[PDB]
Design a protein around this ligand. Structure first.
Ligand SMILES: C[C@H](CCC(=O)O)[C@H]1CC[C@H]2[C@@H]3CC[C@@H]4C[C@H](O)CC[C@]4(C)[C@H]3C[C@H](O)[C@]12C
Ligand SMILES: C[C@H](CCC(=O)O)[C@H]1CC[C@H]2[C@@H]3CC[C@@H]4C[C@H](O)CC[C@]4(C)[C@H]3C[C@H](O)[C@]12C
Lengths: 128, 129
C-alpha cells in the first residue's frame, strides 16, 4: 500500500506530533528497517534503524523540544511529501528556534524509506 | 554547488519574484542548459531550455498568476534549498490557489540544475483562495 496523497499528509503530520511529544520508539517505528536520513541535507546519511534511533535519542533525549507544522503538508501521488515546520529547543538553558523543511519518501508499507531535512545556520536562532 | 546558503536564499526568493511578475525570459535564464524540472513531482521530468521555456509560457502570464513566499527559504551548504509558497491564479475566470514547496539544486555557476515541485490536488483550491 503506497500511501495516497491524503495518507502522506496524515503520516507526515503524525511524525511532527511524535517529535513534539518526544516518543523516540514510535518515531523509529515509522521508518523502514533500512531507511536513510540526511539531516541536515548535505551531511553524510545515516542508515538503518539502529543509527536512526541513536540520532533521535541524541537530538530529543536531552532538553525539551517542541515542533509544529507551519504550513500544510505538500503531497505527491508517488508516495512522497514535503512539509515546513519550526522546532524550538534549548542549548544550555537558552531557548533556540529553527525553521526546517523535510522531504520524505514512503514505501509500499507506509514506512519512511528516506528523509531529507533542509536547513542551515541561516534558519537558526540561538537567542530566542 | 557554488552558491552559499545565503546566496541560495536570495536566488530562490528572486525566482518567486520573477514568477510573480511573469517574466518568462528572466526565469528561463536562471536555468542551466542541462537542467530538469519535475512539476508536479511524480510526473516525467522535462529537460532543456526549449521544453522549460514552453512549460513556463504555458503556465504563466495571462489571467494573472501571483506567487508569494509563505515562509523562509531553507538553504543548505551544498547549493540546495527548499521553500514554501502560495500561487494564486484563475481557471475560466474563477480564482484558485495552490500551496507548493519547491526543492532546487544549483550548479557551480549559480544556475538551477534541478527543480522539483511538491503539490497535488490536496493542496489545491478551485473556489477562490
Ligand atoms: C530530531 C529532530 C527532527 C529531525 C528532523 O525531522 O529534521 C531535529 C530537529 C532540529 C534538530 C536540532 C537542531 C539544532 C542542533 C543541531 C546539531 O547538529 C545537533 C543537535 C541539535 C539540537 C539538533 C537535534 C535534532 O536533530 C533536532 C531536534
Ligand atoms: C509555472 C508555475 C511555477 C512552477 C513551480 O515553481 O512550481 C506553476 C505554479 C502552479 C502551476 C499551475 C497549477 C495548476 C494547474 C496544473 C495543471 O497541471 C497545469 C496548469 C496549472 C495552471 C499550473 C501552471 C503552472 O505550471 C503553474 C502556474
Amino acid at each position: 500500500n503506497l500511501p495516497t496523497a491524503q495518507e502522506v499528509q496524515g503520516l507526515m503530520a503524525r511524525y511532527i506530533e511524535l517529535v513534539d511529544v518526544g516518543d523516540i520508539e514510535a518515531i523509529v517505528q515509522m521508518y523502514a528497517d533500512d531507511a536513510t536520513v540526511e539531516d541536515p541535507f548535505g551531511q553524510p546519511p545515516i542508515h538503518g534503524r539502529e543509527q536512526i534511533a541513536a540520532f533521535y535519542r541524541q537530538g530529543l533525549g536531552g532538553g525539551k523540544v517542541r515542533a509544529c507544522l507551519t504550513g500544510p503538508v505538500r503531497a505527491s501521488h508517488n508516495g512522497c511529501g514535503a512539509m515546513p515546520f519550526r522546532v524550538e529547543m534549548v542549548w544550555n538553558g537558552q531557548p533556540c528556534a529553527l525553521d526546517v523543511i523535510d522531504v520524505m519518501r514512503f514505501d509500499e508499507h507506509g514506512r519512511i524509506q528516506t528523509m531529507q531535512a533542509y536547513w542551515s545556520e541561516v534558519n537558526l536562532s540561538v537567542r530566542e
